[PDB]
């Protein structure tokens, strides 16, 4: 019927002065742009159709042509930045915002999706969507006593569009808009649908990837207990952003980090540090490393939860990126920790896997390991057991690798290596 037209026919139809011919041609266009194999977005743009579609968005008397043009423009705006830009240059943003209040749920949903595609282009179009006033009507669509009365696809689309309004940096979203959105976001974070939960956690992680003041406005809403709960979930699509958000939050101040510890997060890390997905392991170790960079009572919480043997484990056998994060965690631990704590680190077995890692080619990991070794020796000199440790390192082959490192391309590497040998092995 409207299946498989040419751009030529679609143009003649749009250029007739017959609303029903126009509707037929607009549906033909939509069906060309909804096929799988490489829709002809550029052909459609070149024929001059965007302005017409945009004008059809305002035809209140013909809701079907509103729907078909909204869908066609959604699919054009899902393409390259140049194609999204063509949609924005046609005046589409204010017209989609007007459509957000349509009494037809499928037209409203299509408007939501199109605005999400436009904001997903980047910071400039995100901020332009916000300036035209989208947040107010978007949030009004969700202002119901119980989210569970909304249709599932509708709620998932609204959530994804909100998440894109919270996304990207340079700049981050305006602070007034973040405060407008957060309450609804926390509500969606307590919903029971897994796709709503995953996209809400993603939005929260976007907002916590910033300076401590963004982190603070998120933590003041009390989402951390719910994030820890989600950190426990079985669906990887929920654990992944929940762990990202927790990690972001612990890049902040010691008191924000403490809010995470007090919600129970550490109890989850035995699973996370042994997770079969490499990315979970790496992200959990990066989080651990930012926790061992905290205060001594926080390091002691790490110890009490039994996580040092898990760090020894990831350092012994893991993807090399995870191992580099584990080295960072060890160095932050030996920098900030008490003597009892560093002794404990050594009694758990850190030295041998730490030494095995000095055979690696990455220069910064080697530098970090040497800093950690320094910190450990310097805990030993406070106890006079420095000879026992020197022996321990000699016995697993570490001192061989340090000597070899004396002659390294990096300056500080050779400097630290020679210092170590001439200061503890003579």
């Amino acid at each position: 019927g409207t299946v498989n037209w040419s751009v030529e026919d679609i143009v003649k139809g749009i250029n007739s002065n017959n609303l029903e011919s126009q509707l037929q041609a607009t549906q033909a266009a939509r069906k060309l742009l909804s096929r799988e194999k490489q829709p002809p977005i550029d052909n459609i743009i070149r024929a001059g159709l965007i302005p017409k579609f945009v004008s059809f968005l305002g035809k209140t008397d013909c809701s079907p042509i509103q729907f078909e043009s909204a869908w066609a423009l959604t699919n054009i705006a899902s393409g390259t930045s140049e194609q999204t830009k063509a949609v924005v240059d046609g005046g589409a943003i204010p017209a989609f915002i007007s459509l957000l209040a349509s009494p037809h749920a499928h037209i409203s949903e299509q408007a939501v999706w199109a605005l999400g595609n436009i904001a997903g282009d980047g910071s400039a179009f995100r901020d332009l969507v916000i300036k035209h006033g989208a947040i107010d009507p978007l949030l009004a669509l969700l202002a119901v006593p119980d989210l569970s009365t909304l249709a599932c696809g509708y709620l998932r689309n609204l959530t994804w569009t909100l998440s894109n309004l919270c996304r990207n940096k340079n700049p981050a979203p305006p602070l007034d808009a973040v405060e407008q959105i957060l309450p609804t976001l926390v509500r969606l974070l307590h919903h029971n649908d897994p796709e709503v939960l995953a996209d809400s956690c993603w939005a929260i992680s976007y907002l916590t990837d910033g300076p401590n003041e963004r982190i603070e406005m998120v933590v003041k809403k009390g989402v951390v207990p719910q994030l820890v709960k989600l950190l426990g979930a079985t669906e990887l699509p929920i654990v992944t952003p929940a762990l990202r958000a927790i990690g972001n939050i612990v890049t902040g101040t010691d008191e924000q980090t403490q809010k995470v510890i007090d919600a129970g997060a550490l109890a989850v890390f035995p699973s996370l540090l042994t997770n079969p997905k490499t990315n979970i392991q790496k992200e959990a170790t990066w989080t651990m490393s930012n926790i061992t960079a905290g205060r001594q009572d926080q390091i002691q919480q790490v110890v009490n939860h039994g996580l040092v043997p898990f760090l020894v484990g990831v350092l012994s056998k893991a993807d090399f990126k995870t191992q580099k994060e584990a080295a960072w965690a060890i160095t932050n631990y030996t920098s900030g920790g008490t003597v009892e704590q560093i002794v404990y680190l050594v009694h758990c077995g850190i030295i041998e896997p730490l030494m095995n890692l000095l055979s690696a080619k990455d220069t910064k990991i080697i530098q970090v390991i040497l800093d950690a070794i320094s910190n450990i020796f310097q805990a030993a000199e406070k106890l006079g057991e420095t000879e026992k440790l020197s022996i321990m390192i000699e016995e697993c082959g570490g001192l061989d690798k340090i000597e070899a490192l004396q002659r390294h391309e990096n300056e500080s590497v050779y400097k630290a290596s020679l210092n170590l040998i001439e200061k503890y092995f003579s």
């Binding site: 909804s34 999706w113 998440s163 699509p237 890049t251």
Partner: peptide, 22 residues
């Protein structure tokens, strides 16, 4: 000298853009 280190490469994430197939 311990330091908190933000995420190496932040950008499994949701699609930035989505085609509507039906």
């Amino acid at each position: 000298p311990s330091v908190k280190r933000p995420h190496a490469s932040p950008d499994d994430q949701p699609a930035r853009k989505r085609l509507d197939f039906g």
